[PDB]
Amino acid sequence: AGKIPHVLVIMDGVGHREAIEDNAFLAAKTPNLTAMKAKHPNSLISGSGEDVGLPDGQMGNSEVGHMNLGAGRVLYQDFTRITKDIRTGAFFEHEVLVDAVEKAKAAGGAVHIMGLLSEGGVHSHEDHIVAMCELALKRGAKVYLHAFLDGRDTPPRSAQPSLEKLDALFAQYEGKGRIATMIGRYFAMDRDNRWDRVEQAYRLLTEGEAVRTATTAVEGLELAYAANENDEFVKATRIGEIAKVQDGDSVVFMNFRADRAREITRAFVEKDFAGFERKVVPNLSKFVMLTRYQASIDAPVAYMPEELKNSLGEYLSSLGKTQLRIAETEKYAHVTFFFSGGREDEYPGEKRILIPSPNVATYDLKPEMSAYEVTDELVKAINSGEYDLLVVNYANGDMVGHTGVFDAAVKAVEAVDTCLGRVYEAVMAKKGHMLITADHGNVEQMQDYESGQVHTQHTTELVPFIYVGPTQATIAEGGVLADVAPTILNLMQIPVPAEMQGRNLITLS
Ligand SMILES: [Mn+2]
Ligand SMILES: [Mn+2]
């Protein structure tokens, strides 16, 4: 104990946008942040596009963002890697993917492909899914696509062109493949142990169990829209005849992001699965995770992760320092394996506190979420003097911003601001240092002018970067997420490890 606290606050989904219209951050009462900015040095940093190793124009996200924050360097992203392999043709000869196809063919089964079907680019990309379908079709396989509909990394009603694209592909191999089922990502891609949701996707895939049937994918979507469902929440829909994932088939899950892929993957492959009582469990010829969703899941992986040495968490552990990771459960991955650079287990000296997210259908119903309890625990931790580094994620801006509901998003921002007043008080009393920042924007734009729909996605806006400490300082312009860890190490008066490539942004005065 008796340690000076260094606190990294990630206001998930809180960006800086000058425009006032539909800006829930500016509309919110943020007296603590306003006061902090008036007193303490503050700047803007970038968490989108090439600055975080993504294509120019691609919005940031929590996986890429927390990995960059923790790593102190820009990482080569799996999105890039897979896109490159498709471009060069290497994808189509990938031994793991080819093996899935050949094993299904040998068993006289089918290749079932599933994944988020949109151009969002956060968890998947439909062009990758086209590529996997083509890979299997060109090898003479029977192919069924199970589409998980988006509306969260894309506009809330936007699935139609994606479904049409895949229909058009299958039309080029007439009778050999088709879209079999559709369901919203709310069901298929849960990450907070809402197993009642996951079960709906699981039973659709394994039994063809559906709320509605339709003759075509687009007809299915029209039925969902008529039932007042948006893409994210589309109920289990079966197209045409039952096409079960059954014994001898192969499944390829085409998502490249881990957090929302773990639950449905476990439902298929985990030996003693306990999320829910499964009615049918197929013995697959192969189940492929496109990337490594979880080290302990016993299934082959197509694209294994690169080694990441001396992320901030690892490096502090190597120095015998202590650290806290704290968030609500919806952001578990973010403050654990995303921030740690891929490692799932605690480092020596690392403690985790995960507060259950509220047991509600959507977070516009409780925009304060579990932020107040997170704050209770964080303040206690800061005051204990037991931690050299404390990393907190506040989920609210991001999670409520994804609902597309402006008034709720305003309340989410207000909740975070109130909480930060208490964090500030504790840090100042302990003569500590704090960086308040974000991983990407979201809440600062709540209307999508390109579609006329509410805005449910991230933005490409810069994010705030506020330095709270015992003294003033100057902050260099042009910072990126990779600069945060070297900046923290400078505040801690600890040398930056060779593996970090970012720069210190802060000059104390
Ligand atoms: Mn985020
Ligand atoms: Mn988000």
| CATH number, position 183 | 3.40.1450.10
Among all bound ligands, the one having the nearest atom to the CA of 69 is 1
Final resolution, Å: 1.5
Asked whether the beta carbons of 498 and 13 are under 8 A apart, the reply is no
Six-digit token string for 324: 């806290």
Tokens 């499944």 locate to 251
- Does the annotation list 19 as a binding residue? no
Number of H helices, E strands in the chain: 17, 18
* CA of 251 relative to ligand 1 center, distance in Å: 29
* CA of 458 relative to ligand 2 center, distance in Å: 6
- Does the annotation list 440 as a binding residue? yes
DSSP 217-247: HHHHHHHHHHTT--GGGPPPEEESS-----T
* CA of 61 relative to ligand 2 center, distance in Å: 6
The 10 Å Cβ neighbour count of residue 241 is: 9
C-alpha distances in Å from residue 233, one per residue of 199, 229, 404, 452, 491:
14, 6, 14, 20, 45
The strand ranges marked E within 153-273 are: 177-184, 212-214, 237-239, 250-253
Question: In which domain, by residue range, is 129 found?
Answer: 79-289
**Active-site residue list:** 62
> Under DSSP, is residue 436 helix (H, G, I), strand (E, B) or coil?
strand
**Residues contacting residue 175 through CB under 8 Å, at least 6 positions apart:** none
> Under DSSP, is residue 142 helix (H, G, I), strand (E, B) or coil?
strand
- Does the annotation list 298 as a binding residue? no
H-run or E-run covering 66 = helix 62-71
Asked whether the beta carbons of 2 and 425 are under 8 A apart, the reply is no
- Does the annotation list 12 as a binding residue? yes
Biggest distance spanned by C-alpha atoms of the chain: 72
H-run or E-run covering 144 = strand 142-149
**What is the rounded distance in angstroms from the CA atom of residue 423 to the CA atom of residue 434?**
9
C-alpha distances in Å from residue 435, one per residue of 11, 209, 279, 392:
11, 49, 49, 11
Experimental method: X-ray
